[PDB]
Amino acid sequence: MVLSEGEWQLVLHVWAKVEADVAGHGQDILIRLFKSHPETLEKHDRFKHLKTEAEMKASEDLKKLGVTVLTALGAILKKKGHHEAELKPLAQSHATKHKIPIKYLEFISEAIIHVLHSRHPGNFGADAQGAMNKALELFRKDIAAKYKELGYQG
Ligand code: HEM
């Protein structure tokens, strides 16, 4: 798939707001993911023991992971589709080391959309959400193709 320049502008415009508080958005997104799909928490040997949302909010390790996730995703989005180089090491670690099924990438995509809709209603109307969804779908499709080449595809 290919996004138009107008769609990229909608995506990067809301992303600029997200970047005013990377740590806070990172926390919100991961907690939303863990609450909505607890099975994803099991993949994180580092956080598997957290029992409540309060414990999650207090974890400095989870906050650091959130910043790492958003910083990597932001670098990919800013490439506006020309992200092959950035995708390779990410696909390799998530397929071979962490063993993350594509299904879980869809779950985190849902969490990103939920949080942006909650925090940026004025900059995340229907058109902006459609553009962000298209960007995340492109990301998942390209990662899935890489998983297959790497021998995982799942
Ligand atoms: C927007 C999608 C995502 C991005 C950009 C992303 C990015 C990253 C980055 C950059 C790291 C650190 C270096 C590495 O190991 O590659 C990481 C680690 C990891 N990711 Fe992801 N990730 C994503 C989605 C997921 C999902 C959905 C899961 C699990 C349900 C996941 C599980 C992990 C695990 C287990 C680690 C290691 C965490 C640790 O250090 O203990 N990732 N991810």
Question: Is residue 30 lining ligand 1, measured as CB closer than 6 Å?
Answer: no
Crossing angle of helices 126-150 and 60-77, in 10° steps, is 90
Q: Which of 102, 115, 90, 93 is nearest to 30 (CA)?
A: 115
CATH number for position 30: 1.10.490.10
Could you tell me the residue range of the domain that residue 35 belongs to?
Answer: 1-154
Render the chain in DSSP notation, one character per residue: ----HHHHHHHHHHHHHHGGGHHHHHHHHHHHHHHH-GGGGGG-TTTTT--SHHHHHH-HHHHHHHHHHHHHHHHHHTTTT--HHHHHHHHHIIIIIS---HHHHHHHHHHHHHHHHHH-GGG-SHHHHHHHHHHHHHHHHHHHHHHHHHT---
User: What is the Å distance from ligand 1's center to 94 Cα?
Assistant: 7
Resolution of the experimental structure, in angstroms: 1.8
Question: Is residue 118 lining ligand 1, measured as CB closer than 6 Å?
Answer: no
Question: Is residue 77 lining ligand 1, measured as CB closer than 6 Å?
Answer: no
Number of folded domains that form the chain: 1
Output the residue whose Cα is nearest ligand 1's atom 36: 98
User: What is the Å distance from ligand 1's center to 69 Cα?
Assistant: 6
Dihedral Cα 154, 103, 101, 61, nearest 10 deg? 170
Structure tokens at 46: 């580092």
User: What is the Å distance from ligand 1's center to 15 Cα?
Assistant: 19
